[PDB]
């Protein structure tokens, strides 16, 4: 049967980028041509593979990661990028093999009074390794005094809200991102394009 890409692209609610969702796709037939021409996409970039070649290839597993960031940050969802999102929220490896797809979601994820439910990790001591997910909410220590779980001076909550309002400039508007990763192990393949 068909691979459930629509459950990812057509999901009514998306995850915050710090707690990005991952859908493991296996043992199915994938129709990529219909998937990529469904909705209009503002960002469509593939790395290491052509999007028209996927209908010929087989992979052990395909991962569909999805989250929401703002417009000025879509450029960070790419191999070799740095920044608050790429370092502390969602990191792609330098040899990333897959496609990054994004579209404007101002109508869905912005509110008149501001939608503060979408968060991102603002403070972290070290960078994330590729495909790492950190959902910790421990108080960040920015000084020499330990925080002991109490916010204060040099003691910050690590997450920060976006606050999406539909009249903001496109750089501040929310964008839903879907990252397709194509893993090729020395195991029998389960996802072939057709």
């Amino acid at each position, epitope marked *: 049967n068909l691979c459930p890409f629509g459950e990812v692209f057509n999901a009514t609610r998306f995850a915050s980028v710090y707690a990005w969702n991952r859908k493991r796709i296996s043992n199915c037939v994938a129709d990529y041509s219909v998937l990529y021409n469904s909705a209009s996409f503002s960002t469509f970039k593939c790395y290491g593979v052509s999007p028209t070649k996927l209908n010929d290839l087989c992979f052990t597993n395909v991962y569909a990661d999805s989250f929401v960031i703002r417009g*000025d940050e879509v450029r960070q969802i790419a191999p070799g990028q*740095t*920044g*608050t999102i790429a*370092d*502390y929220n969602y990191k792609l490896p330098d040899d990333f093999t897959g496609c990054v797809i994004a579209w404007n979601s101002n109508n869905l994820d912005s509110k008149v009074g*501001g939608n503060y439910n979408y968060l991102y990790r*603002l*403070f*972290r*001591k*070290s*960078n994330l390794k590729p495909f790492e997910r950190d959902i910790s909410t421990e108080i*960040y*220590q*920015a*000084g*020499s005094t330990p925080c002991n779980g109490v916010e204060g001076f*040099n003691c*910050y*909550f690590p997450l*920060q*809200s976006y*606050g999406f*309002q539909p*009249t*903001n*400039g496109v*750089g*501040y508007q929310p964008y839903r991102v879907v990252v397709l990763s194509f893993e090729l192990l020395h195991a029998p393949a389960t996802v072939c394009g057709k």
Partner: antibody
Amino acid sequence: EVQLVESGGGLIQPGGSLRLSCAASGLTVSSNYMSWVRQAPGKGLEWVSVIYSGGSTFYADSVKGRFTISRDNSKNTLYLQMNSLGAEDTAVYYCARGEGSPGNWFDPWGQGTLVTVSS
Amino acid sequence: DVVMTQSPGTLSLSPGERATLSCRASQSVPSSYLAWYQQKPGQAPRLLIYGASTRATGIPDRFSGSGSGTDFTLTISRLEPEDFAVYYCQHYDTSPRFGGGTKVDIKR
């Protein structure tokens, strides 16, 4: 007792190099967003560089390829290596914790040091 | 990116009056990204207001920020001679941006 003590300013010939220092007390440099902001004589404020706690560095287009921001954790000090200096680089250079973003504003600020590019 | 313009260039008011400083843009900017800084002669800038309307620690009550979208306002009630300074608005789009600054002179 939060302080950012700056030094390293002074006279430098055109095309020369200079390294500024920002010794911190009351916060950990390697654990914060740390920025340099400069102000030319009689002009406004211009952000120049930032270094993340994770190690990432970013620069304004006016100084890319010529400036390098760094830090020394054992000395708890922020640095700014300035190369290929010109008349546009003459300014008071401030260091500050933060990046001017939500939950991450420029606070506190150093006292500033004056760089004079002259022959 | 969004360019923010401050107005007026110079404000001359007597002590006790109310100072109105504007920071405008042709695009709407989320108010959580707006900040105000004060710089007195020979001193470093200090954070006055962040998130458009939240007063920084130790800042007197007469400094208040407000506005949203395309019009942000710094208000200095009960103007004092010590308030002589240049005030900058500040925001982050793809990099930290500072406005041109508004100079507040005090008449006497």
